[PDB]
Nucleic acid binder design. Structure first.
Lengths: 60, 78, 100, 95, 79, 316, 144, 183, 108, 49
RNA sequence: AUGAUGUCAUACUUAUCC
């Protein structure tokens, strides 16, 4: 369990796991989770993810 | 190794150019550079506590290249 | 004030009686106790100025000649919008001096 | 205690409470005085008197034991006079 | 009915006469209720703040003023 | 209930301008209780003559901020600042930021950075990394203010309104590093603060007359229009400050209040001159105007011409 | 006229307010007071904040003249800086059950409270609501 | 009736500001919310001390005060010292003092709004964090190198420092002008 | 005393035995003509240019706003039963009898 | 340890206290044993006896 | 190496006062 500035006064190990889970890089990690530019009709039909568009570009 | 002993210095040097000086290598967490009270001047030898030991062993390797006032600086483990 | 720390003010309701200052305490402020920057006049209470209590000094309590005023430093600090600062009590001042 | 219920002297008489208060003052203070009768007259002069203020005025007047019983006897007679539709205590119906 | 509690005076000192100043032994709920009462009085006093508060809600100005006057007494409950 | 609207184009699409409007669902006007939000998209067909509903992407929080930023749309729903892109079925959120204090009330996007305005907290400067799609806040303010509207005066200076009837202008320090990775390290100093006395909700720095100088024209909720003009000369600013100091002693307000206390209601005054108090020199007494002109070592028509020159330079 | 010289006196007050002996802190504090009333409204507040830093530790003492001095000081600083910054120094001290910090910070907070009670409204922070009581004022969260 | 410090730190979102005396308050949630504000200032350190914040500097006899350059460049200090030596007048100039007060005016070093006065506040002259690759002038003088600092020649052989792993220093992996030889 | 030039600028001076203060503004690409009118019971000036500005003092403060209409070549004050306070303005091959009812010193 | 003040007084550097007169600093020689408290600084300056 | 209390001088403030 890596320590932190909020977990300095922690004594029990049960609270430290929850503190490391909540501290876990806040809640982000989403820079390009939609950019895919699906041609199809290019107006209202292009629901795809980043990995799905990457697999569609690698396949065709 | 977290601490080092540093000999052969000139009193115009103080705790600050040691701070700045050894953090050039790696940060000095705890600095000790005696001020002598009686004649109000420094003998020029130092003790340095680091974050952990790796800092200080690299410090043994690199560390004795410093030259304070044209003159040689002793750094060894402690 | 700085001369008498045990003195207590009246702090009564403000009336229409304009305050006055004695000839020995002329120019001195009531709250700030300074000599420069007069900005607002001193108003006395209704019970504090009645009969023989009219025309008396607020700080000195003697025969008032000129009208007293408040300091501008006390006016900007909102220390002049309080009650009537008439000196009611008189302790540790002009008591042993009468014996000598 | 007994001095927590709100009462009103406007719905009760005053001439019927003078002999019981005089007997209570003669039993407490021993003799008959003019300051205690005046204090009892001033305590009942208001239309909405204060039981705690009267107890403090008569709570220490004696010694601090007979005055509490006097206040408890005067509060119950006033309560019986104000609860009745006539406005008299129970000691005035028989005589 | 011995109460032995006559909060009368001592030596012409203290004797709080203002409202909303507070003391060192002031509780948290009493200070929060005093701050809420001061905020309600500042909302009722300022005309622009009352207008900005009534423009957002669908209520009128006098109804919001009566609601703020009715909610001044016992805003929290436990002091 | 709609609260935000924006009309721009997408980088993934062509030259078709889309009108995105964020709305809320079951919004309580008391306990700020909200059930959900939505964002409808329009086509703006017939060269902006008819709108066609393309898609309506829902949201968990009520959106109160919609602004274009480098071909994408920045959507602020509550305390979550998200960068959404144009999609065929719904607005795909490419980024997200949850570093807001209470709720994002306004968003002004610079060409490089982004300035979001909170509800009870002052506006903060945030840099958006294009490489990793991560928005990082690199600057913040030291004093909280209930901001209602704001406008970017420069690349580092931003002026924002207050809900308490004040106006403030914050400028970033030149040593602030935008490339980074009590709340924030770098703080922004407030260079100008003035209590206007009226609730301002619209600020725009532009030229009211062709040939003149641009001024900070501001609106009010009480049906008033004002303008703030910067001083071009230090001697003219000192002359205006001396004229205001003479007028505060010679012509007091009729409501018994102090001019400095009225200007310092919410925030202390910093580099602000009230021209309305200086305009009373022509309406005051002629002997008092002559005394003020003798204290200013000029004439009362000279002071009137000096007051009218700034109005002719900055206004209609 | 102190709108200029404030700067000149500022570092020296730093040296004086940093205490050699109590009279330094006292008198220097009085200087901060009269300066603070004098400069009001002219936009110099920044350096006055800096000086307020060094003023702030002196809050604690039993010596009558230095405590009343400091009181006058923080009052003038109240009007000059504006209440918001004051209160932001006076928040945490309220709470303290220790028979000292609460006495004092509540004395201060009262001094800040009586005057400018009207302008304090905005600056009370957000305080979460507990079981029996609702401590959030939702009026400020009404959004058009 | 009073919660512990661990329960107050686990419930607070910012537990790096909680103290040991905050548990003895009447409302720890409001105190923890007010202490974690954006532009808030902490209380002084004399809340628990018994020296009244002015009795700790007993034996410290440093310089009482230092005049600025705008007053020292007017010649009034030397004239005042000559007058004090004669007592134990000058009439140098009248426009030079106005020039030193208006044109030759130096802005003093102010402080931040949160920069409160500490107890000592003279022995902790801390300044940012002059790290690896950036040094002061004089120590250059002791080093005596004309315009890499020469132990970054040995930062070639022995390797990049464990202490500052992110390091780049000129000429090695960092492809430098003036003082600053590494970033 | 107001004086209009052939360019889009005019310069005024006070009425005195000697010439005192002066003021000027860009009224332009049109010859600035001067016409006297009666506005709100006071003597006002009516300019004839690309924009028709009407100068009038308001509580020891001048106030001149342009007209929200077309430009005219000549203008003169009018007073009748149907138009108590109006201005007869001559346009390009057309005559128009107009009147300024609402205070045109502020933004219309 | 004897140091002169700027007002005609003495101040002890080792005792870190003030001296009202010349006899006050001359009576903090046998007393004010700050010399015995310098043994920690002498041991920190030199580890050997 | 602070702090503790206590006999005992010494400076300082209160525009302190005949």
């Amino acid at each position: 369990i890596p320590n932190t500035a909020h977990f300095a006064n922690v004594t029990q190990i049960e609270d430290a796991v929850s503190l490391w889970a909540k501290l876990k890089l806040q809640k982000a990690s989403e820079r390009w989770q939609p950019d895919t530019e699906e041609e199809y009709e290019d107006s209202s039909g292009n629901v795809v993810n980043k990995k799905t568009y990457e697999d569609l570009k690698r396949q065709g | 190794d977290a601490t080092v002993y540093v000999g052969g210095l000139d009193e115009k040097v103080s705790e600050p150019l040691l701070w700045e000086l050894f953090l050039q290598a790696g940060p000095v967490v705890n600095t000790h550079m005696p001020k002598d009270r009686v004649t109000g001047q420094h003998q020029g030898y130092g003790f340095v506590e680091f974050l952990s030991e790796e800092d200080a062993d690299y410090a043994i390797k690199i560390m004795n290249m410093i030259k304070l006032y044209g003159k040689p600086i002793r750094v060894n483990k402690a | 004030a700085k001369h008498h720390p045990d003195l207590i003010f009246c702090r009564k309701q403000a009336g229409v009686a304009i305050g006055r200052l004695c000839e020995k305490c002329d120019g001195k402020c009531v709250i700030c106790d300074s000599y420069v920057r007069p900005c607002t006049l001193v108003r006395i209470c209704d019970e504090c100025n009645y009969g023989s209590y009219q025309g008396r000094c607020v700080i000195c309590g003697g025969p008032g000649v000129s009208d007293a005023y408040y300091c501008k430093e006390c006016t900007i600090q909102e220390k002049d919008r309080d009650g009537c600062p008439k000196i009611v009590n008189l302790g540790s001042s002009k008591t042993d001096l009468f014996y000598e | 205690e007994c001095l927590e219920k709100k009462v009103d002297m406007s719905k009760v008489n005053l001439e019927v409470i003078k002999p019981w208060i005089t007997k209570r003052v003669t039993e407490i203070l021993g003799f008959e005085d003019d300051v205690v009768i005046e204090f009892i007259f001033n305590q009942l002069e208001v239309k909405n008197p204060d039981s705690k203020m009267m107890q403090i005025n008569l709570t220490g007047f004696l010694n601090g034991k007979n005055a509490r019983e006097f206040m408890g006897e005067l509060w119950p007679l006033l309560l019986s006079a104000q609860e009745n539709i006539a406005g008299i205590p129970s000691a005035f119906l028989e005589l | 009915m011995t109460d032995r509690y006559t909060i009368h005076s001592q030596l012409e000192h203290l004797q709080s006469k203002y409202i909303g100043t507070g003391h060192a032994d002031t509780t948290k709920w009493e200070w929060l209720v005093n701050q809420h009462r001061d905020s309600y009085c500042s909302y009722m006093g300022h005309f622009d703040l009352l207008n900005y508060f009534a423009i957002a809600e669908n209520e009128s100005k006098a109804r919001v003023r009566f609601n703020l006057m009715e909610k001044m007494l016992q805003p929290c409950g436990p002091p | 209930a709609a609260f935000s609207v924006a009309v721009c184009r997408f980088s993934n699409t062509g030259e078709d301008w889309y009108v995105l409007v964020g709305v809320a669902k079951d919004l309580i006007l008391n306990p700020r209780s909200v059930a959900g939000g939505f964002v409808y998209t329009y086509k703006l067909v017939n060269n902006g003559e008819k709108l066609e509903f393309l898609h309506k992407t829902p949201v968990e929080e009520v959106p109160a901020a919609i602004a274009p930023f480098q071909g994408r749309v920045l959507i602020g729903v509550g305390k979550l600042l998200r960068v959404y892109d144009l999609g065929k079925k719904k607005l795909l959120r490419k980024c997200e930021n949850k570093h807001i204090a209470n709720y994002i009330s306004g968003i002004q996007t610079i060409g490089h950075r982004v300035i979001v305005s909170d509800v009870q907290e002052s506006f903060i400067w945030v840099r958006y990394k294009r490489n990793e799609n991560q928005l990082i806040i690199f600057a913040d303010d030291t004093y909280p203010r209930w901001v209602t509207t704001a406008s970017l005066l420069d690349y580092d200076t931003v002026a924002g309104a207050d809900k308490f009837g004040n106006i403030c202008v914050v400028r970033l320090p030149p040593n602030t590093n935008d490339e980074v990775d009590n709340g924030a390290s770098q703080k922004a100093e407030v260079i100008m603060n003035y209590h206007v006395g009226e609730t301002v909700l619209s600020l725009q720095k532009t030229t009211l007359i062709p040939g003149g100088s641009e001024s900070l024209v501001y609106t009010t909720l009480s049906g008033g229009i004002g303008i703030l003009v910067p001083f071009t000369s230090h001697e003219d600013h000192d002359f205006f400050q001396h004229v205001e100091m003479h007028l505060r002693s010679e012509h007091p307000p009729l409501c018994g209040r102090d001019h400095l206390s009225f200007r310092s209601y919410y925030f202390p005054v910093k580099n602000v001159i009230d021209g309305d108090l200086c305009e009373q020199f022509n309406s005051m007494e002629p002997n008092k105007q002559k005394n003020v002109s003798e204290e200013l070592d000029r004439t009362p028509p000279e002071v009137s011409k000096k007051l009218e020159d700034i109005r002719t330079r900055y206004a209609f | 006229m102190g709108k200029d010289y404030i700067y000149a006196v500022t570092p020296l007050l730093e040296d004086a307010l940093m205490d050699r002996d109590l009279v330094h802190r006292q008198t220097a504090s009085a200087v901060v007071q009269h300066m603070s009333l004098g400069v009001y409204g002219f936009g110099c507040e920044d350096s006055l904040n800096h000086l307020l830093n060094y003023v702030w530790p002196n809050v604690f003492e039993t010596s009558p003249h230095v405590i009343q001095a400091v009181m006058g000081a923080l009052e003038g600083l109240r009007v000059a800086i504006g209440p918001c910054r004051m209160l932001q120094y006076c928040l945490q001290g309220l709470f303290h059950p220790a028979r000292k910090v609460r006495d004092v910070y509540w004395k201060i907070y009262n001094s800040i409270y009586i005057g400018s009670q009207d302008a304090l409204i905005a600056h009370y922070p957000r305080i979460y609501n507990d079981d029996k009581n609702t401590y959030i004022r939702y009026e400020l969260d009404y959004i058009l | 009736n009073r919660f512990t410090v661990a329960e107050l730190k686990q419930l607070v979102a910012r537990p790096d500001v909680v103290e040991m005396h905050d548990v003895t308050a009447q409302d720890p949630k409001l105190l923890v919310h007010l202490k974690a504000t954006r532009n808030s200032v902490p209380v002084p350190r004399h809340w628990c001390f018994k020296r009244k914040y002015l009795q700790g500097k007993r034996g410290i006899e440093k310089p009482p005060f230092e005049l600025p350059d705008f007053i020292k460049r007017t010649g009034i200090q030397e004239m005042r010292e000559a007058l004090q030596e004669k007592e134990e007048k000058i009439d140098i100039d009248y426009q030079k003092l106005h020039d030193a007060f208006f044109k030759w005016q130096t802005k003093p070093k102010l402080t931040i709004h949160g920069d409160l006065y500490y107890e000592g506040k003279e022995f902790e002259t801390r300044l940012k964090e002059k790290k690896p690759g950036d040094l002061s002038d004089e120590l250059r003088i002791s080093l005596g190198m004309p315009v890499p600092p020469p132990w970054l020649i040995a930062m070639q052989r022995y390797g990049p420092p464990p202490s500052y792993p992110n390091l780049k220093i000129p000429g090695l992996n960092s492809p430098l002008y003036g003082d600053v030889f590494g970033t | 005393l107001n004086i209009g030039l052939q360019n889009g600028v005019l310069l005024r001076t006070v009425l005195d035995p000697v010439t005192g203060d002066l003021s000027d503004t860009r009224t332009g690409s049109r010859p600035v003509k001067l016409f006297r009118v009666r506005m709100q019971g006071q003597e006002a000036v009516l300019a004839m240019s690309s924009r028709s500005w009407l100068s009038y003092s308001y509580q020891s403060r001048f106030h001149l706003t342009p007209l929200s209409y077309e430009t005219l070549e000549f203008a003169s004050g009018f007073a009748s039963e149907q138009c108590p306070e109006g201005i007869v303005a001559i346009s390009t091959n057309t005559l128009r009898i107009l009147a300024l009812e609402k205070l045109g010193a502020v933004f219309n | 340890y004897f140091m002169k003040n700027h007002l005609g007084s003495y101040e002890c550097k080792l005792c870190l206290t003030l001296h009202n007169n010349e006899g006050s600093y001359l009576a903090h020689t046998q007393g004010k044993k700050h010399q015995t408290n310098l043994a920690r600084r002498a041991a920190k300056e030199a580890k050997e006896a």
